[PDB]
Design a protein around this motif. Structure first.
Motif, PDB file in Angstrom:
ATOM      1  N   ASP A 374      -7.173  81.931  59.981  1.00  0.00           N
ATOM      2  CA  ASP A 374      -5.397  81.337  61.497  1.00  0.00           C
ATOM      3  C   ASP A 374      -5.853  80.127  62.098  1.00  0.00           C
ATOM      4  O   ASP A 374      -4.930  79.551  61.591  1.00  0.00           O
ATOM      5  CB  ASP A 374      -5.284  83.073  62.384  1.00  0.00           C
ATOM      6  CG  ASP A 374      -4.051  82.526  63.305  1.00  0.00           C
ATOM      7  OD1 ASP A 374      -3.673  81.480  63.006  1.00  0.00           O
ATOM      8  OD2 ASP A 374      -4.330  83.414  64.129  1.00  0.00           O
ATOM      9  N   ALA A 375      -6.831  80.452  62.526  1.00  0.00           N
ATOM     10  CA  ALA A 375      -7.578  79.050  63.440  1.00  0.00           C
ATOM     11  C   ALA A 375      -9.004  79.150  63.706  1.00  0.00           C
ATOM     12  O   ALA A 375      -9.921  79.856  64.278  1.00  0.00           O
ATOM     13  CB  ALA A 375      -6.353  78.858  64.775  1.00  0.00           C
ATOM     14  N   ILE A 376      -9.209  78.258  63.119  1.00  0.00           N
ATOM     15  CA  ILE A 376     -10.955  77.811  62.960  1.00  0.00           C
ATOM     16  C   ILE A 376     -11.436  76.604  63.692  1.00  0.00           C
ATOM     17  O   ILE A 376     -10.251  75.778  63.941  1.00  0.00           O
ATOM     18  CB  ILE A 376     -11.510  78.086  61.785  1.00  0.00           C
ATOM     19  CG1 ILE A 376     -10.843  77.392  60.530  1.00  0.00           C
ATOM     20  CG2 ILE A 376     -11.624  79.423  60.826  1.00  0.00           C
ATOM     21  CD1 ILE A 376     -11.111  76.893  59.266  1.00  0.00           C
ATOM     22  N   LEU A 403      -1.400  76.703  60.865  1.00  0.00           N
ATOM     23  CA  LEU A 403      -2.767  77.358  61.187  1.00  0.00           C
ATOM     24  C   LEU A 403      -3.407  75.944  62.159  1.00  0.00           C
ATOM     25  O   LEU A 403      -2.368  75.749  62.590  1.00  0.00           O
ATOM     26  CB  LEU A 403      -4.321  77.351  60.365  1.00  0.00           C
ATOM     27  CG  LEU A 403      -4.483  78.006  58.965  1.00  0.00           C
ATOM     28  CD1 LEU A 403      -3.337  78.479  57.834  1.00  0.00           C
ATOM     29  CD2 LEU A 403      -6.060  77.868  57.944  1.00  0.00           C
ATOM     30  N   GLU A 404      -4.549  76.756  62.580  1.00  0.00           N
ATOM     31  CA  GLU A 404      -5.116  75.150  63.656  1.00  0.00           C
ATOM     32  C   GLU A 404      -6.365  75.531  63.386  1.00  0.00           C
ATOM     33  O   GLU A 404      -7.610  75.940  63.423  1.00  0.00           O
ATOM     34  CB  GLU A 404      -4.555  75.931  64.999  1.00  0.00           C
ATOM     35  CG  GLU A 404      -5.351  75.002  65.873  1.00  0.00           C
ATOM     36  CD  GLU A 404      -5.084  75.248  67.228  1.00  0.00           C
ATOM     37  OE1 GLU A 404      -4.393  75.802  68.180  1.00  0.00           O
ATOM     38  OE2 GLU A 404      -5.289  74.404  68.212  1.00  0.00           O
ATOM     39  N   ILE A 405      -7.241  74.005  63.284  1.00  0.00           N
ATOM     40  CA  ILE A 405      -8.263  74.092  62.797  1.00  0.00           C
ATOM     41  C   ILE A 405      -8.861  72.491  63.897  1.00  0.00           C
ATOM     42  O   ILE A 405      -7.955  71.529  64.715  1.00  0.00           O
ATOM     43  CB  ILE A 405      -8.451  72.508  61.875  1.00  0.00           C
ATOM     44  CG1 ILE A 405      -7.403  72.674  60.457  1.00  0.00           C
ATOM     45  CG2 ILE A 405     -10.013  72.292  61.094  1.00  0.00           C
ATOM     46  CD1 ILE A 405      -8.552  74.811  60.148  1.00  0.00           C
ATOM     47  N   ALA A 406      -9.836  72.996  64.807  1.00  0.00           N
ATOM     48  CA  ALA A 406     -10.610  72.423  65.889  1.00  0.00           C
ATOM     49  C   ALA A 406     -11.650  71.323  64.679  1.00  0.00           C
ATOM     50  O   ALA A 406     -12.331  72.527  64.389  1.00  0.00           O
ATOM     51  CB  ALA A 406     -11.128  72.609  66.767  1.00  0.00           C
ATOM     52  N   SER A 407     -12.530  70.097  64.781  1.00  0.00           N
ATOM     53  CA  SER A 407     -13.889  69.557  64.693  1.00  0.00           C
ATOM     54  C   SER A 407     -14.304  69.002  65.372  1.00  0.00           C
ATOM     55  O   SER A 407     -13.586  68.176  66.391  1.00  0.00           O
ATOM     56  CB  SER A 407     -13.165  68.739  63.943  1.00  0.00           C
ATOM     57  OG  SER A 407     -12.569  67.507  64.710  1.00  0.00           O
ATOM     58  N   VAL A 408     -15.438  69.559  65.587  1.00  0.00           N
ATOM     59  CA  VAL A 408     -16.224  69.344  66.806  1.00  0.00           C
ATOM     60  C   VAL A 408     -17.661  68.454  66.285  1.00  0.00           C
ATOM     61  O   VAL A 408     -18.379  68.829  65.681  1.00  0.00           O
ATOM     62  CB  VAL A 408     -16.667  70.239  67.944  1.00  0.00           C
ATOM     63  CG1 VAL A 408     -18.051  70.209  68.780  1.00  0.00           C
ATOM     64  CG2 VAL A 408     -15.416  70.918  68.242  1.00  0.00           C
ATOM     65  N   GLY A 409     -18.160  67.451  66.757  1.00  0.00           N
ATOM     66  CA  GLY A 409     -18.759  66.349  66.625  1.00  0.00           C
ATOM     67  C   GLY A 409     -18.513  65.430  65.746  1.00  0.00           C
ATOM     68  O   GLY A 409     -18.197  64.164  66.264  1.00  0.00           O
ATOM     69  N   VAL A 418      -7.492  67.774  60.972  1.00  0.00           N
ATOM     70  CA  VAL A 418      -8.216  67.650  62.399  1.00  0.00           C
ATOM     71  C   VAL A 418      -7.311  67.691  63.502  1.00  0.00           C
ATOM     72  O   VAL A 418      -7.017  67.035  64.550  1.00  0.00           O
ATOM     73  CB  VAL A 418      -9.306  67.085  62.312  1.00  0.00           C
ATOM     74  CG1 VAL A 418      -9.757  67.470  60.270  1.00  0.00           C
ATOM     75  CG2 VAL A 418      -8.561  66.050  62.253  1.00  0.00           C
ATOM     76  N   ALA A 419      -7.946  68.292  64.989  1.00  0.00           N
ATOM     77  CA  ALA A 419      -7.931  68.153  65.849  1.00  0.00           C
ATOM     78  C   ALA A 419      -9.378  68.266  66.703  1.00  0.00           C
ATOM     79  O   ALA A 419     -10.063  69.001  66.722  1.00  0.00           O
ATOM     80  CB  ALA A 419      -7.541  69.481  66.983  1.00  0.00           C
ATOM     81  N   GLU A 420      -9.308  66.680  67.365  1.00  0.00           N
ATOM     82  CA  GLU A 420     -11.349  66.647  67.572  1.00  0.00           C
ATOM     83  C   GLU A 420     -11.363  67.105  69.166  1.00  0.00           C
ATOM     84  O   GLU A 420     -10.488  66.909  69.791  1.00  0.00           O
ATOM     85  CB  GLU A 420     -11.479  64.957  67.791  1.00  0.00           C
ATOM     86  CG  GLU A 420     -10.766  64.373  68.815  1.00  0.00           C
ATOM     87  CD  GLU A 420     -11.231  62.860  68.542  1.00  0.00           C
ATOM     88  OE1 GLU A 420     -11.623  61.932  67.216  1.00  0.00           O
ATOM     89  OE2 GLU A 420     -10.342  62.081  69.396  1.00  0.00           O
ATOM     90  N   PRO A 446      -8.859  84.945  62.565  1.00  0.00           N
ATOM     91  CA  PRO A 446     -10.131  83.256  62.078  1.00  0.00           C
ATOM     92  C   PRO A 446     -11.042  83.745  62.195  1.00  0.00           C
ATOM     93  O   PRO A 446     -11.259  84.224  60.989  1.00  0.00           O
ATOM     94  CB  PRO A 446      -9.533  83.665  64.093  1.00  0.00           C
ATOM     95  CG  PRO A 446      -9.801  84.350  64.769  1.00  0.00           C
ATOM     96  CD  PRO A 446      -9.274  85.785  63.858  1.00  0.00           C
ATOM     97  N   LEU A 447     -11.558  82.417  62.423  1.00  0.00           N
ATOM     98  CA  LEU A 447     -13.652  82.475  61.770  1.00  0.00           C
ATOM     99  C   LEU A 447     -13.344  81.362  62.479  1.00  0.00           C
ATOM    100  O   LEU A 447     -13.334  80.563  63.531  1.00  0.00           O
ATOM    101  CB  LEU A 447     -13.736  82.835  60.608  1.00  0.00           C
ATOM    102  CG  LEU A 447     -13.582  81.185  59.628  1.00  0.00           C
ATOM    103  CD1 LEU A 447     -14.200  80.287  58.961  1.00  0.00           C
ATOM    104  CD2 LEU A 447     -13.421  82.289  58.272  1.00  0.00           C
ATOM    105  N   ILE A 448     -15.240  81.172  61.910  1.00  0.00           N
ATOM    106  CA  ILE A 448     -16.103  80.204  62.750  1.00  0.00           C
ATOM    107  C   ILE A 448     -16.917  79.555  61.883  1.00  0.00           C
ATOM    108  O   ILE A 448     -17.790  80.049  61.397  1.00  0.00           O
ATOM    109  CB  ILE A 448     -16.037  80.179  64.445  1.00  0.00           C
ATOM    110  CG1 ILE A 448     -16.660  79.128  65.072  1.00  0.00           C
ATOM    111  CG2 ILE A 448     -17.078  81.962  64.350  1.00  0.00           C
ATOM    112  CD1 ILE A 448     -15.969  79.524  66.504  1.00  0.00           C
ATOM    113  N   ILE A 449     -17.179  78.164  61.865  1.00  0.00           N
ATOM    114  CA  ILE A 449     -17.870  77.589  60.542  1.00  0.00           C
ATOM    115  C   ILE A 449     -18.385  76.078  61.806  1.00  0.00           C
ATOM    116  O   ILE A 449     -18.483  75.314  62.066  1.00  0.00           O
ATOM    117  CB  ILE A 449     -16.733  77.149  59.493  1.00  0.00           C
ATOM    118  CG1 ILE A 449     -17.429  76.788  58.295  1.00  0.00           C
ATOM    119  CG2 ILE A 449     -15.861  76.030  59.995  1.00  0.00           C
ATOM    120  CD1 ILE A 449     -16.169  76.980  57.121  1.00  0.00           C
TER     121      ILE A 449
END
Ligand code: SF4
Ligand code: SF4
Ligand code: FES
Ligand code: FES
Lengths: 692, 213
Positions: A374-376, A403-409, A418-420, A446-449
């Motif tokens: 779903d959203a990771i 979906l919804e993706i975030a990107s940290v880093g 992506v969504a920074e 969801p998950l977290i990666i």
């Protein structure tokens, strides 16, 4: 919800709304085709799947005719048997006379297809002749003769939709149609070379393996890719001494019949810089020596140095065998020192999380579960780079569902959206409590990666302690039937090494060694090694790891041996040996057996089966191959990951920089292969590799 | 049907919009739903062909940046169409029809009179950047059968002796025709004269009703 119909008398039932060509595949009636594909969008460009349909005025394409009940499908109507000869003949009046120079000699799908259903003659004997097409330079990876192309659209739909490099395209009408950028600009997506397995003619083919062999000469061997976290199910084409090429054999879960680019072209370094004999240092000079003399020098300098404990450093690398590291750990701890550390910077301790509870170092959802994702959010990684097969799964999911993706880093260029969020663990901790503590609680599957590059950071533990709280705090991400904590590795082996228990102690992290054991492990530095240290390298080619060495030992690479590998998913997979170890190289664990014998160490095995039983002793999930089990310990595992590095790690404001320098230069083979040197130079901000 | 990166056609040569052209493009994009904001890729490049005299590569890159698109879609759509001309041409684009209804009334002598008054091939342009020949298929004006097309104005019903007049007329600069043919018939009228619809007034439907309304 399913539909039963009749294909050539054969009644067959299939799920409603599907394509007719899948029903023909299910019924067992073979229908030829050129532009249908399973994992691709459906276009009826090929005209090959013509088939007779009751209640149809004309024969229609079986690729895009939807399944309707009460259907009578006939394939051997004389109109249809006329039609297939017709369409083949129409296709073969602009395809040029290149069958002895075309790469896909026996593998031309068109050609075998044109033997069953082709005409006797071809009445092209016109004067002024066929069309002809420009050379169309693309890159140093993909050989391109667009004259042989038939515009089967199978290239461009893939690089459009799944590979996510939309630079390919169809330009022009009629015979003025071409494929590709008419800028003449460089294509690159991080799975670029996957189109040359995909164009069914030899329009797009392999540039380094251009004409070296020919697919009836080949010996094929099903095996496993390394230098990749997924361990994709591949096939090695070998003439018998060298290794000609690799082609992904089909598998549903792990790769869906795709393969990494670096996984594809890696065979060049597999035959050009290999260690073929043991070389002993004289002092700024290596000379090759007797295979006894090397190991006798090892025993002699062991008697000289005498590391009695915490002074025998044993480090393994990125593409190294599970079965070899068993021999390693057995040798080191019968020697009496668990100085047993990974190649990674900040590998000289435990990797800031539990070696226990396999979930701490594995991929706890299924890779098949990413369709249900779903959203990771990624942290500290470029999953376009690390496991590009995963990126293919991500883009397929993101196009299919919502979906919804975030990107940290690090700020990456994804194929998808992506969504920074930030470049600080404080920015991360702000983002967890900012809005996605609501979203990941809301989300169903969801998950977290997490990439492995954060293991490089000494502030990893508090970096775990935040995220290890969140999985503990949210019961949506941590339920029974899946677990949201998901980590990756940069290798095909550090997951297997973490199954071995390949970690130093807190006591073993302190003493500078006297006798360093290299097993692969290219990315050590002069800082990571003591001055007078005994630094015997065991590998396959010549890299930085062989450059510091005292004695090098030619061990076989991943091709030549009966390997055993574990991905980040946890699949234990056999690597069937395609050829023998060349020159004077041997298999790795067999070398470690004799190295034990010239010391006082007696390894209790001498065969492969006895290793398999010893490996069953370490973990029985590694002799039970390629079958993914879940973990019944979710909450206890996350909590025990929390309690260890709790508090004592003080996170600095170090920005989450990129894990790798370049994609196509790593793991001692991309540096060995000249094709990846010339790949590397062409692939940074070039005007042909730029977009605007 | 491809691109050469030599001169006057670069990704690096700059291109902008006139603010009237900018406002016109902003007018066009609002005609379509914002989900398909790329669906205006056809007439927007038309505005580029109005601003710069030919479809360059730079105008296509600029529109792809404007519409938030990968550039290959713009590349495809302007390649797939005939009218987005990717080479620099002269001032006056000759679009002379060749199709059989034009041909049966003698479009051959038309084109031969043109390229004997000029000296250029039907893909070739005049070296003075004045006239650029192009054979073309049936432009929809098939009844007025010997025709041609200056940039928007079709010129119809042409005799090849009278045609080379119009050719040197446009060569002089300020002399086109008014837009129609050589003042014969009309457009739909017969060659002799108007036979039917010789009524001075429109008869109305106001009495001509269904009676059930
Ligand atoms: S693809 Fe190549 S080898 Fe196959 S039929 Fe065509 S020219 Fe011959
Ligand atoms: S580029 Fe190759 S695969 Fe793609 S349509 Fe052309 S011939 Fe087929
Ligand atoms: S795939 Fe059925 S017509 Fe092309
Ligand atoms: S027929 Fe040639 S333009 Fe109408």
């Amino acid at each position: 919800a399913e539909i039963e119909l009749t294909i050539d008398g054969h009644k067959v039932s299939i799920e409603a709304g599907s394509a007719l060509i899948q029903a023909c595949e299910k019924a067992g009636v073979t229908v030829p085709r050129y532009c249908y594909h399973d994992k691709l969008a459906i276009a009826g460009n090929c005209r090959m799947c013509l088939v007779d349909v009751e209640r149809a005025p004309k024969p229609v394409a079986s690729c895009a005719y939807p399944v309707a009940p009460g259907m009578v499908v006939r394939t051997d109507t004389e109109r249809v048997k006329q039609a297939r000869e017709n369409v083949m003949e129409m296709m073969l009046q602009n395809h040029p006379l290149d069958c002895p120079v075309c790469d896909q000699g026996g593998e031309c799908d068109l050609q075998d297809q044109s033997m069953r259903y082709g005409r006797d003659r071809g009445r092209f004997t016109e004067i002024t002749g066929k069309r002809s097409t420009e050379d169309k330079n693309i890159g140093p990876l993909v050989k391109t003769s667009m004259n042989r192309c038939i515009h089967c659209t199978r290239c461009v739909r893939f690089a459009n939709d799944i590979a996510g490099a939309p630079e390919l395209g169809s330009s022009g009408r009629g015979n003025d149609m071409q494929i590709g950028t008419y800028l003449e600009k460089n294509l690159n997506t991080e799975l670029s070379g996957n189109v040359i397995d995909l164009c069914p003619v030899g329009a797009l083919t392999n540039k380094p393996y251009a004409f070296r062999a020919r697919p009836w000469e080949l010996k094929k061997t099903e095996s496993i890719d390394v230098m990749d976290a997924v361990g994709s199910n591949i096939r090695i084409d070998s003439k018998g001494v060298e290794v000609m090429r690799v082609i992904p054999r089909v598998h549903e879960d792990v790769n869906e019949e795709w393969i990494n680019d670096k996984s594809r072209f890696a065979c060049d370094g597999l035959k050009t810089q290999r260690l073929t004999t043991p070389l002993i240092r004289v002092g700024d000079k290596f000379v090759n020596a007797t295979w006894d003399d090397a190991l006798s020098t090892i025993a002699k300098a062991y008697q000289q140095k005498a590391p009695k404990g915490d002074e025998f450093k044993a480090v393994a690398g990125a593409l190294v065998e599970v079965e070899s590291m068993v021999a390693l750990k057995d040798m080191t701890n019968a020697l009496g020192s668990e100085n047993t550390t990974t190649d990674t910077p900040n590998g000289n301790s435990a990797p800031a999380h539990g070696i226990t509870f396999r979930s701490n170092y594995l991929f706890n959802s299924s890779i098949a579960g990413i369709e249900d994702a779903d959203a990771i959010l990624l942290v500290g990684t470029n999953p376009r780079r690390e496991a590009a097969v995963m990126n293919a799964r991500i883009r397929k999911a993101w196009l299919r569902q919502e979906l919804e993706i975030a990107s940290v880093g690090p700020t990456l260029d994804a194929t998808f959206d992506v969504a920074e969020l930030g470049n600080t663990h404080a920015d991360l901790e702000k983002a967890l409590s900012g809005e996605f503590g609501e979203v990941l609680k809301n989300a169903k599957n969801p998950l977290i990666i997490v990439g492995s590059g954060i293991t490089d950071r000494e502030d990893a533990g508090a970096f775990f302690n935040t995220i290890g709280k969140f999985v503990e705090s949210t019961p949506s991400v941590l339920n029974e039937n899946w677990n949201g904590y998901n980590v990756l590795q940069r290798s095909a082996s550090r997951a297997g090494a973490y199954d071995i228990g390949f970690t130093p102690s807190d006591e073993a992290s302190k003493t500078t060694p006297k006798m360093v054991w290299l097993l692969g492990a290219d990315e050590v530095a002069a800082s990571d090694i003591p001055a007078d240290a005994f630094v015997v390298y065991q590998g396959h080619n010549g890299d930085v790891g062989a450059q510091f060495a005292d004695v090098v030992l030619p061990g076989a690479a991943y091709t030549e041996k009966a390997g055993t590998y574990v991905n980040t998913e946890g699949r234990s997979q056999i690597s069937r040996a395609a050829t023998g170890p060349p020159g004077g190289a041997r298999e790795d664990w067999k070398i470690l057996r004799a190295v034990s014998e010239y010391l006082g160490v007696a390894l209790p095995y001498e065969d492969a089966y006895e290793v398999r039983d010893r490996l069953a002793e370490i973990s029985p999930s590694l002799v039970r191959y390629d079958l993914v089990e879940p973990t019944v310990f979710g909450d206890v595992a996350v909590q025990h990951s929390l309690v260890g590095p709790n508090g004592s790690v003080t996170p600095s404001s170090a920005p989450l920089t990129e894990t790798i320098e370049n994609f196509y230069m790593t793991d001692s083979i991309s540096r060995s292969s000249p094709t990846m040197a010339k790949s590397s130079i062409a692939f940074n901000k070039d005007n042909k590799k730029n977009q605007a | 049907s491809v691109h050469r990166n030599t001169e006057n056609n670069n990704p690096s040569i700059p291109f902008e919009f006139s603010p009237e052209n900018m406002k016109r493009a902003e007018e066009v994009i609002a005609k379509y739903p914002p989900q398909y904001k790329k669906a205006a890729v056809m007439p927007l490049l038309d505005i580029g062909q109005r601003q710069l005299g030919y479809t360059s590569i730079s105008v296509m890159n600029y529109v792809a940046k404007l519409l938030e698109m990968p550039p290959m879609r713009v590349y495809e759509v302007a390649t797939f169409y005939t009218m987005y001309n990717r080479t620099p041409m002269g001032r006056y684009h000759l679009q002379i029809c060749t199709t059989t209804p034009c041909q049966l009334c003698g479009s051959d002598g038309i084109m031969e009179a043109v390229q004997n008054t000029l000296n250029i091939k039907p893909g070739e342009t005049t070296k003075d950047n004045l006239f650029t020949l192009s054979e073309v298929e049936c432009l929809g004006a098939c009844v007025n059968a010997p025709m041609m097309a200056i940039n928007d104005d079709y010129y119809e019903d042409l005799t090849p002796e009278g045609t080379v007049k119009l050719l040197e007329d446009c060569k002089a600069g300020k002399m086109p025709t008014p837009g129609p043919e050589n003042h014969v018939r009309r457009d739909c009228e017969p060659a002799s004269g108007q036979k039917v619809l010789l009524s001075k007034e429109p008869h109305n439907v106001a009495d001509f009703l269904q009676e059930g309304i």
